[PDB]
Amino acid sequence: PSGEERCIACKLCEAVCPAQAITIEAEPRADGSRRTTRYDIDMTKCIYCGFCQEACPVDAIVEGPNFEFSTETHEELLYNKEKLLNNGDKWEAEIAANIQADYLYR
Amino acid sequence: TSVKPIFSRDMNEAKRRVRELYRAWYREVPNTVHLFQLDISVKQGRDKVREMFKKNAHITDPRVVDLLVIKGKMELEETIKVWKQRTHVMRFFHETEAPRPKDFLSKFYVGHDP
Amino acid sequence: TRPTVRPRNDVAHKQLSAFGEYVAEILPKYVQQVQVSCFNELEICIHPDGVIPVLTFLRDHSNAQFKSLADLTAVDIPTRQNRFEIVYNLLSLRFNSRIRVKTYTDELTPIESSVPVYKAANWYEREIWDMFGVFFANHPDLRRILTDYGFEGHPFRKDFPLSGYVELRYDDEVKRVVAEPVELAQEFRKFDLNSPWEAFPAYRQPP
Amino acid sequence: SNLIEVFVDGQSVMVEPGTTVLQACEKVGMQIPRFCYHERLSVAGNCRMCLVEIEKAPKVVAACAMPVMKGWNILTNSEKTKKAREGVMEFLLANHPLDCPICDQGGECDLQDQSMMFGSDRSRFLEGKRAVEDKNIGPLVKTIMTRCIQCTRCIRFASEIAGVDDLGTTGRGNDMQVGTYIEKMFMSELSGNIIDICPVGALTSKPYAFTARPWETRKTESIDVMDAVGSNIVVSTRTGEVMRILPRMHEDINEEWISDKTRFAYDGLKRQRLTEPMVRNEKGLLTHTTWEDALSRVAGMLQSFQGNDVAAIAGGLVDAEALIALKDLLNRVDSDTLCTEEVFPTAGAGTDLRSNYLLNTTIAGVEEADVVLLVGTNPRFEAPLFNARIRKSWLHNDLKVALIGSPVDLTYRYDHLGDSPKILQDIASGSHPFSQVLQEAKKPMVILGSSALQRNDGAAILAAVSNIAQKIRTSSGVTGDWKVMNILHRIASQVAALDLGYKPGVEAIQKNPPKMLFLLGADGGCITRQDLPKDCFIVYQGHHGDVGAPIADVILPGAAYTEKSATYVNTEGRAQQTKVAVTPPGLAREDWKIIRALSEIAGMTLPYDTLDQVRNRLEEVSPNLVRYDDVEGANYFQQASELSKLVNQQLLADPLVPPQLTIKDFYMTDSISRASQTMAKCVKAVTE
Amino acid sequence: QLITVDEKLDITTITGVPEEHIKTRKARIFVPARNNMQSGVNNTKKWKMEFDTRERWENPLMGWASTADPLSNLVLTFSTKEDAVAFAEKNGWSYDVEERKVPKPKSKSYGANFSWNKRTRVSTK
Amino acid sequence: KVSPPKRAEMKTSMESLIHHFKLYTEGYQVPPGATYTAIEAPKGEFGVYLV
Amino acid sequence: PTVKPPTARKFIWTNHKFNLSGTPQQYVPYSTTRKKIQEWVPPSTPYK
Amino acid sequence: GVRTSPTGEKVTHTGQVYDDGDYRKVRFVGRQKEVNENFAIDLIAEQPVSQVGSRVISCDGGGGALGHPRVYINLDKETKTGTCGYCGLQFRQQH
Amino acid sequence: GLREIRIHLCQRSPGSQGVRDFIEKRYVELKKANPDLPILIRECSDVQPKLWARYAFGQEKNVSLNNFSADQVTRALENVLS
Ligand code: SF4
Ligand code: SF4
């Protein structure tokens, strides 16, 4: 809620990803925080299996409800950290409500 | 050093099988150039066939020779029955691959590969 | 009475042990080892010379009747001088039982084709030849079945790289699909996952 | 003979008396769980994770501290044993913080791994946890002390291995805290090893923080080149980048430790790098060019000079392959002026006899010595892992150590004989009381530092020290095969260069100034343009832009030790080879290949094209250079002593003062460490 | 019936491996060193075969690590040094073998911590 | 040690966090062995020979 | 959302955006990390 | 905050920006560079420090099982605040 | 002219006994005579003993010394030095 990233660069999502679709680099931020400098998802490697959001200990990476994001070029499906943070800012209102409905089954 | 043979008891039987396969490939090249409508000539096809046989000229194990002949025959059956396509037949010629240097200095300039 | 632990079935274990030695008594010329797993599967380890006698006996014998070849495959273990293990999984409908028969071979030693015993073996043996390079003698029609035409190598060998040696693309200059040495925009990332602490003392090997 | 019989799970094993229960289990291939125990530290017995049942004995014993008894049957998988482990693991995890996602130890944590293998799968702790404050102990080690499990490994390592009694425990009970009590830095030259021994993420590497996880790193087994010890390391890389350096166990060299320079200077490989060939433009400024142009200019100049007009200087991080390739190249123009920056006296036998310039006792031989004489050396900073071996003997063998030189802190009490080089003549004549100790000693060891030979009377120093060892061996009372005389080196490339026949020191260049000069990684500044003709042509081949590069006419970028498979000979004479962890950056190339390519352009092609072929060449020059991990013995010390006495020399009146007197001079001693931003932090911290 | 074949096993022409990746490669046969960050020794039991490291470069689009080396990830496990060498001989690879490094046996004594007159006496527990 | 803990427990208990961490990185170890397991799949017998 | 409005956050987009593929404001990938190796810079003055 | 490089390219929260002469910025010509404008480092620093009356406090990020793993923070040092290693919230001891 | 002499021998093999005898006996006098000539004696186990001579411009000749006597070794070096 404060606007801080949930992701702590633990790399559990990267380890479990069946498709090796996640690439992560991290270092200490300008303050002492443990944060990513690279967070990529190759959406053309991803199998949309959801293991990454299961593996995440802080609910940082989620699969949202959007399924209407087909593109005209391949490169537009290679998401870097800026694109994914924008997705979270774009979809948080729906995402938080969906997690609210399902987190007691998890 | 006692082992189970594949087809040939010794290297003289094996070389007989090798010569027979070479004849079958030699006879086939004119048909392959015709059926697949290749822009190479029959000499080029037969030169390539000869090249493939000479890369293995140093084998002395009849079981290894038996397998190369076995694989060579499957390779030929794919061609005669047109299970292969033009792309598969032309993969032997590496047309789109640029020439990699073999001398030291040329390798030195491009990168680190020995 | 232990909700999470798989129950044992010692009756089936007893029955399979008795049959395992029954097969060893009838086929001593070939059988090299018989074992029964803790989850009750019987494996017969035979000399490769006995593939036809052993499979024929299991199919035709009145106390066997393994009329169905469920699966036939190979395993590659590079540390063995006979690196390939050939595995036959058979099912007997009459006695509602399964049996596994295993043998071995290397890159240059042929294994007798079992198509005369099980016609199901025809494609299974082509797959083994295709993916492992094991040659099956007297096969009615041995050729690649899964790999691309003209493909070179046997991908299921442990020393064959995951991504192979060649990749394909369409080239406009020659107006056809071409094969070229493989380059990956992102190399597959090898993970070292094995923990350095032993997990199963029951399987420890002598030092 | 005296072996007693015990049983592990009913299997008989014969062990020496005094063997612990934990050691008896290892002989049948079982590893008992542990936290506080470490085979190179004193036994503690506090974590209780090694508790194991002895058959028909009511109480479980601490397997790490309990000597076995004849006939004992050690039930290492009993219900009693397994339930002891579950209880102990449960207490360890009660106050432990839920940190694994943010903890650097994650994935290579003994607490995680032994919880998985020997612990329960859930928690019944329903209270709040302890939280401890963090403690600053310098820029190299981060402390998140709430993760500490009070195993005291760091305390025992700091005291026993580093010889520093700064770490301890304060308070008691559940509030007992590991630390220094006061605000204090733990900045030993071996301090980084407490990161490795700490079983949890309580002590982690500050430079490495958060950058990688264990499972995703590729491990290249290599050799350190920050000193002449030859420490075995593992370079951890990920996606073509070097992430950290770890020790690699070698009992006869570094055991399982490394120095801080070895561990933390790798970040100097990421900065100030030579990545492209460079030549001087039309205004005398270096500009990027291609390899073809750069090599042509050098080859053109090479073809116009001969004899004394061509010389070379090999720096401290050069590999044997580059050394032999450059020697052959200059030989083909009849030049013999192949020099090193590091001086060795060429008087007498010089480099003719390997025994004259080697650590003949070997590193592991220190553990058999009974008296050690150190001359003109601060082994603490010149060879940190060699000084740790001395302290190990000083501690476990009651070794007697004496020193001639500055009274530096060696981390163990020694007998300071004085810093005057004249003291050596008194020992030899028998006047000095310490002369009697050497006669008494049954395995004496005299060690002369290579730094003491950088003086202008190094030949006198070597002859004096060599003389003392000569009397000891002639005096009898010493087993024949024991070696007394030793030279302790500090430069990774020195021994290989002396083996190949390089002249030690740049004296020859000063004697006969050349017209064309090769600087093979030479960054000591021994030769500058003021010692050379005005229009001298200087080629610098190296991996860092430091001292040599900014004065060169041509720059040929080479590979660092992490970027090539190259041979280095340590101070014992043992040859070792690195492996490629990552490839050289940019346009840089393997160093012997640059010389081989330059030879073809110059029309003087060398007769080897591959790494195996150049290594066959090394065998021709010195066959020991391809016997990896083998220490070939060198004899004929009597011959060296005879020659050394022929020419009288006078010692100077300068007292022996090593180049390194305190820790601040340890961190930067070469191009890589000088470009390391971590080493700069260490220097700032220890001087502020 | 069996035949006598009096040659060293050599299968490089029936493995499909390209010429470049048989004779330019250098296999290393070794037992992996213990990860010094942990005390467990279970990853030091088997012999490994790995090949020489080659170039990895940055993908222009995303910055990923690209490779043109098909053997970069190929690692083989063997029971003994002899098995690994035999596998490399018959495949035509040049190899370097490294002796297994077993930890030395140590003399451990808890009572040494309290010595009457030795230096092993500890100043803290 | 086989099935990951519930998320609420992973965020409260030290044992659960450790086991979650290890299951989603290393995964559980399987005792050595081999099985041919088959079911009556809709298309017939579907089996795995898992080593 | 009229009856059950969503939770308001400062960082949530106030203005929703449709699919921008094929337009000047489409997403273009790039590496988000900085250069890893620093190259030596030669001195700017002559001295040789 | 989102600076702009002298060329005009926006600098990201990771400090990334193509330098002058880097051809790779051609990929943004006629298009745009995707940059998230909500820098987490700035937002977290706007949260007020929380005063607590105990030596140790616990943080789960808020929201119960929707937050992060619960950690306990020590507040003994008075020269600084106690920070949560997961969410970056700061705590101080009330006298 | 001659530039360098390298002698390789085994520390223990009986095939190197003559060379070991030469080094122990008459190396000091050979070096005393040729002060500026490098005579690199390099011992390595299980190597065939051998004499290497390097002349101007990188030309090298090697002479085997296997099972040579201390006298034969002396003859071999005299040929090289002359
Ligand atoms: S959903 Fe996609 S990114 Fe996530 S684990 Fe599955 S394949 Fe990987
Ligand atoms: S998204 Fe979650 S699982 Fe992935 S690195 Fe970040 S915190 Fe770890």
Ligand code: SF4
């Ligand atoms: S020390 Fe180990 S158990 Fe403790 S938080 Fe770190 S990884 Fe987890």
Ligand code: SF4
């Ligand atoms: S800091 Fe680490 S090594 Fe030191 S006592 Fe705590 S857990 Fe043990």
Ligand code: FES
């Ligand atoms: S390992 Fe024995 S009590 Fe700690």
Ligand SMILES: [K+]
């Ligand atoms: K640690």
Ligand SMILES: [Zn+2]
């Ligand atoms: Zn928090």
